[model samples]
Target: MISLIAALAVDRVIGMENAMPWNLPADLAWFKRNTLNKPVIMGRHTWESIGRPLPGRKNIILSSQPGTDDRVTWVKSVDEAIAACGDVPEIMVIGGGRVYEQFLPKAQKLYLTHIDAEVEGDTHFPDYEPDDWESVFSEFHDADAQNSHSYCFEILERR
Candidate 1:
């Protein structure tokens, strides 16, 4: 299965100045739990922001430049990235806007975290239609000492 995973604000803001605008521990844990051991594909900017390959997962980065080590694989296109995964049952496309837009059409499932606040951001997730997807799972998380904003973890399958 091709899956897209992201955390965006209510206005679909995903990034600002090359980093996430919010700090939510719950979303961080959720991301790690779901993406662990899976082949994760991300854009060059995402890779740069992360600064290193994610542990326990094959990191496939879409970039023109060659990868520095064996820990990550660099591919020039989405097809190349998918091929690098080597026939996996599922591949996670974790992103920095452009990668998400490129993979959205091919994705079968979306793991979305919807933040309640609308902060200013330079990057945004691609707009998708609700009618094109079916919500398979959803859970709301209230703001607490650990989390800054109320958010919802929702899984949507292509309809």
Candidate 2:
């Protein structure tokens, strides 16, 4: 199965100035828990933003240029990314907006953290109708000292 994991603002804003616009530790922890030990595919910009391979997962990056790190596999397109994923039980699509748009349709599961703030961002998650998906799980959290905004964590699957 292919799964997507993302944290976005209420307006579907995902990145501003090439980085996340909010601080949400609870959401970050949830992201780590779900993506750990999986083969994660992401775009070049995402790899550049992260700066390194995520711990405990095989890192596959989509880029026209080859990667220098021994820990990461570089591919030119989504076709190459899928080939690199092999027959993994679950391939995690972690992203920048471009990567998400490419994989969203093929995703069987989605782990999303929706922040309750409308912030300016150049990147946005692709729009999808809620009616097309089944919300299998959800957890809401309020803002705290460690988190800058209230957010809802939701897991969905195509209906």
Candidate 3:
């Protein structure tokens, strides 16, 4: 099944430019550790921001543009991404806005880091009705401690 992972503000702002506005080493570490050997799918803009392939993971980039990179296999649609991943137990849909919206309906789980602070951003997370998902797990972290920002790690599964 597909899964979406992101950290966002109260307003659902995810990023300002192509990059993330906040730095959370712990969150990055968690993402890396969990997604290491999994298949990762993302939009072209998301791939551009990282500038390189994530090591040890199968990188698949969804782009309408032609040709493909050595680091990513380019697909034109979300269905193609699913087909490409083929029977993999899980596939992570790492995003830019367009990619997330396209795969949101197909996602079985969501891993969201809900930041306490809100900031101006050009990108946003998808909106869903409360009845659509049920929170299965949540952990709150204080700002004064390990992280520079205060946030809650939420894991939701389709209800």
Candidate 4:
């Protein structure tokens, strides 16, 4: 199974250039808690924004001119990515628009944190039918000093 993860603001923007518009440590922690030790695939820009391998997971960067690290493997195409993934039955596709769009049709699940405010961004999340998915889990949180806006973590599985 393949899963995609992202936090979308009220305007549905997942990114503003190479970075997310908001800072939410709680949401970041929620991401790590869910994706730890999993195979994580990211596009060039997304990987660049993150800038380092996440310690507990197998990192796959999809790009030709990518950085090198013992914790990272590089793939330039979907087939190469799958080949690199090997026997992992499930992997996380963390994105930068294009990558998410490429894999959206095949994704089995989505791990999304819905931010309660709007922000300007060049990239937006792809729209899908709510009827096509069913929420399996959800947790809401209010903003704090470390986290800017109210947010909700939702896990949605395709129906």
Candidate 5:
């Protein structure tokens, strides 16, 4: 199975200027802990934003361009990425705008951090009807005492 993990604002903004706008420590920590030791597939831009490969995970970069690195496996398409994952239990599709748009249809599950606040950004998640997916798990966290941003962790399965 392939899972896409990302945090976005109410406006569905994922990034602003190639980086996440919110500073949610808990969310970051959760992401790191969950994604560690997993095969993370991302686009070239997303890889560049990270600056380097994350430790304890196989970093696979998808690109139609030519490139190679010690910590990265560059593939030309989504199918190639799936093929490279081989028999792994699951592959995580980390992203940039283009990559998410291209792979959303092929993904089986999505781990989304849906923030309550609105944000201004150039990139956003693709529009999909609410009836298109089923929410298998959802947990809402309030902003009152713990943090400034209220958010919900939503796990959606394709319908």
Candidate 6:
């Protein structure tokens, strides 16, 4: 299965100043659960923002620069990433806007955390035509010690 995952907040903002606006532990954990042992495709900026390879999963990066690293498989385009990881059961398109937008249509599943806070952001999540997808599951929760705001873990699948 091809899948994508993101944490969107504050009028669909995904990041600000190269980082997530809020640190939501539950959302992070949710990401880890889904992405572990899968192949993840992310943009160069997205990889830099994370600062290191994601342990356990194969990291495939899309960039012009052949980054000097042994831990990652650097590819020139999104198609290469998809092609590189196509044999895997699920290839996760994790992102920083452009990458997510490019792969959104091809992805079969989307795991989202809809955060409640409204805030400014330099980066935003890409728009997708929602009519083609179905909300398969959702779990709502309020803010707590580890989480910054009320949110719902929503899973969307292609209809």
Question: What are the lDDT scores of the predictions, listed in order?
Answer: 0.92, 0.89, 0.86, 0.87, 0.85, 0.89
TM-score rank, highest first? 1, 6, 2, 3, 4, 5
Order by lDDT, highest first: 1, 2, 6, 4, 3, 5
> What TM-score, over all chains together, does every model reach?
0.96, 0.95, 0.94, 0.93, 0.92, 0.96
Better of 2 and 5 by lDDT: 2
Hey, what RMSD does candidate 1 come out at?
1.0
Model 6 C-alpha lDDT per residue in residues 42-82, reported as the tens digit of each score = 99999989999999999999999877787899999877888
What is the clash count for each candidate, in the order shown? 0, 0, 0, 0, 0, 0
What would the per-residue lDDT of candidate 2 be over residues 1-159, giving only the tens digit for each residue? 999999989789999877886777788899899999889999889888888889899999998887767789889889889999898899999998989998998999999998998899999998877888999999998888998789999999998
The candidate 1 region of ten consecutive residues with least summed lDDT is 63-72
Q: Taking the tens digit of each residue's C-alpha lDDT, what string does model 3 give over 8-79?
A: 886999888898888877788768866889999989988989899999999999888884676578888878
Compared with the true structure, what per-residue lDDT tens digits does model 5 show for residues 1-159? 888898889778998898877787767776897689899999998898899999888989998888767668889988898898789887888888888898888888888988887788989987766787899999988886556898898889999
Error of 1 at 71 (Å): 2.3
lDDT: the better of candidates 1 and 3: 1
TM-score, structure 2 vs. true: 0.95
lDDT of 1 by residue, 1-159 (tens): 899999989789999999987899999999999999899999999988998889999999999877766678989888899999998899999997999988899999999999998889999999998899999999998899999899999999999
Pairs clashing within candidate 1: none
lDDT tens digits, residue span 53-148, model 4? 888998999997655665688888977887788788788998879888988898999999999988889998888778999999999988888887
Prediction 6 global C-alpha lDDT = 0.89
